[PDB]
């Protein structure tokens, strides 16, 4: 409560980056705190309670990312010989975690952009913060293609992708939300950002995903998804009722069925819809 105002300052002081990374930046900058002078209660229970307080938003990525950097501090914040440099001075490992998953956007931009086939148009979903940089690195390497955006309509959000893209002279056309079945034959392959990736291999994202995937299966066309290291989770859906209700909110975010996707990208690298499981089990030993 007393530092969720700084999370508000981090969400609306630099609105370029993601929400979860603003939460991680918020709390790790708070680790110059009023000195609790302990390892157990401070780290475990206090950052647990801070995950409970900052999870009051309708996000799914933020709480999972908080648990994730709790696991990325559970590595070797050791019992090293004195309470002077356990973590409250030897703090730079979470700093290098922050730096690595800051440059993770750049390494996804370096990897994925050399896959887009020139000539076949690619309809994209609403504004993510990794589709923009992969298209930036693609058009930076002198391609030719077309791109459409659906609105993803609880609110108009496709034109926000238009005001994102059109600033750098790339052709685009916004298309109706329920009418992606008409445009599905026109496109040949379909990329979509993530609010988070599930252990079964499906994605969770704002609502307009699963109908894109099932029209992709009907047109037998490759469905492509993109995510970063922040957006892993431990949830398990079978049919849609079992995403958690605080992670549901007429859904404001939504799951798509796990393996009628065709290929998936992450910061660990480009991988396969069963490799998702073992490569997240690699995290949190």
């Amino acid at each position: 409560k007393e530092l969720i105002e700084y999370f508000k300052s981090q969400m609306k002081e630099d609105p370029d980056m993601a929400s979860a990374v603003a939460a991680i930046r918020t709390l790790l900058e708070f680790l110059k705190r009023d000195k609790g002078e302990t390892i157990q209660g401070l780290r475990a229970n206090l950052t647990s309670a801070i995950e409970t307080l900052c999870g009051v938003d309708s996000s799914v990525a933020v709480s999972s990312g908080g648990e994730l950097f709790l696991r990325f501090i559970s590595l070797a914040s050791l019992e090293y010989s004195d309470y002077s440099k356990c973590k409250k001075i030897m703090i730079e490992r979470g700093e290098l975690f922050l730096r690595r998953i800051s440059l993770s956007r750049n390494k996804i931009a370096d990897l994925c952009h050399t896959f887009i086939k020139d000539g076949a148009t690619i309809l994209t979903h609403a504004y993510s913060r990794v589709v923009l940089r992969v298209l930036e690195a693609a058009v930076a390497a002198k391609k030719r293609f077309s791109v459409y955006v659906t609105e993803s309509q609880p609110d108009l959000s496709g034109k926000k992708m238009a005001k994102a893209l059109c600033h750098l002279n790339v052709p685009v056309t916004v298309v109706l939300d329920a009418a992606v079945g008409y445009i599905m034959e026109k496109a040949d392959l379909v990329i979509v950002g993530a609010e988070g990736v599930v252990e079964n291999g499906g994605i969770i994202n704002k609502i307009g995903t699963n109908q894109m995937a099932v029209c992709a299966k009907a047109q037998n066309k490759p469905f492509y998804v993109v995510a970063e290291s922040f957006k892993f989770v431990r949830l398990f859906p079978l049919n849609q009722q079992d995403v958690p209700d605080k992670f549901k909110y007429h859904p404001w975010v939504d799951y798509t069925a796990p393996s009628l996707i065709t290929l998936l990208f992450t910061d660990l690298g480009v991988l396969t819809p069963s490799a998702v499981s073992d490569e997240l089990i690699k995290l949190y030993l």
């Binding site: 020139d118 002198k142 030719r144 052709p171």
Partner: protein, 220 residues
């Protein structure tokens, strides 16, 4: 009746003595016709490959059409057997190739059987099929090419609607030069606007045979 003569003579230096014999022999034609007066010859037909030559320009255009739709594999110009990075082009759909510093234009469709080299700035809305653009190229807009040849250093202005050319080093050609099949341009030609040039016109620096002088090619 179905063969064609190409000068790939395997032979031994008995042939060397057979044209120490007739000093008036000059070519392979009177060699093989001096065989037929009586020291023996075979042919060898095959069913697999493509071997021919050119001294003309016509079957040069034919063999360049044979190279790009690849009747000469294994020998393919994208393995880049000669050694530089100035020929670095890949493959794509429809046997088309794109080199380094491509810069293809918005909506500039480029459909069948072409390549492009180094420093080939391409403008928008052009349309090119069954031809070769080489390096040192700049393109306006709506610059249609068809079975043309654009060697090193060439320029062309926008709207130059040109079919079936053969064109050489560091040449310039201005707006609305409509040009017609079976002609050639060579070695720094400059042609201005509104020339709807006819069928055949050899235009190069020599007065007595080429149909310009050491100035440009519109008028003397």
């Amino acid at each position: 009746y179905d063969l064609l003569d190409c000068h790939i003579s395997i032979c031994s230096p008995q042939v060397a003595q057979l044209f120490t014999d007739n000093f008036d022999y000059q070519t392979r034609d009177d060699f093989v016709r001096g065989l037929l007066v009586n020291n023996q010859i075979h042919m060898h037909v095959t069913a697999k490959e493509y071997g021919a030559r050119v001294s003309n320009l016509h079957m040069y255009s034919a063999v360049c059409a044979d190279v790009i739709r690849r009747w000469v594999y294994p020998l393919t110009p994208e393995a880049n057997f000669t050694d530089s990075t100035t020929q670095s082009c890949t493959h794509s759909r429809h046997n088309i190739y794109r080199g380094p510093e491509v810069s293809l234009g918005h909506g500039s469709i480029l459909e069948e059987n072409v390549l492009l080299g180094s420093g080939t700035v391409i403008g928008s809305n052009c349309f090119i099929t069954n031809s070769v653009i080489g390096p040192g190229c700049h393109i306006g807009d709506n610059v249609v090419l068809d079975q043309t040849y654009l060697w090193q250093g060439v320029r062309v202005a926008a709207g130059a609607q040109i079919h079936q050319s053969l064109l050489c080093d560091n040449a310039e050609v201005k707006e609305r030069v409509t040009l017609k099949p079976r002609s050639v341009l060579t070695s720094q030609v400059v042609v201005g606007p509104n020339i709807t040039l006819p069928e055949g016109s050899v235009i190069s620096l020599h007065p007595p045979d080429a149909e310009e002088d050491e100035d440009d090619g519109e008028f003397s």
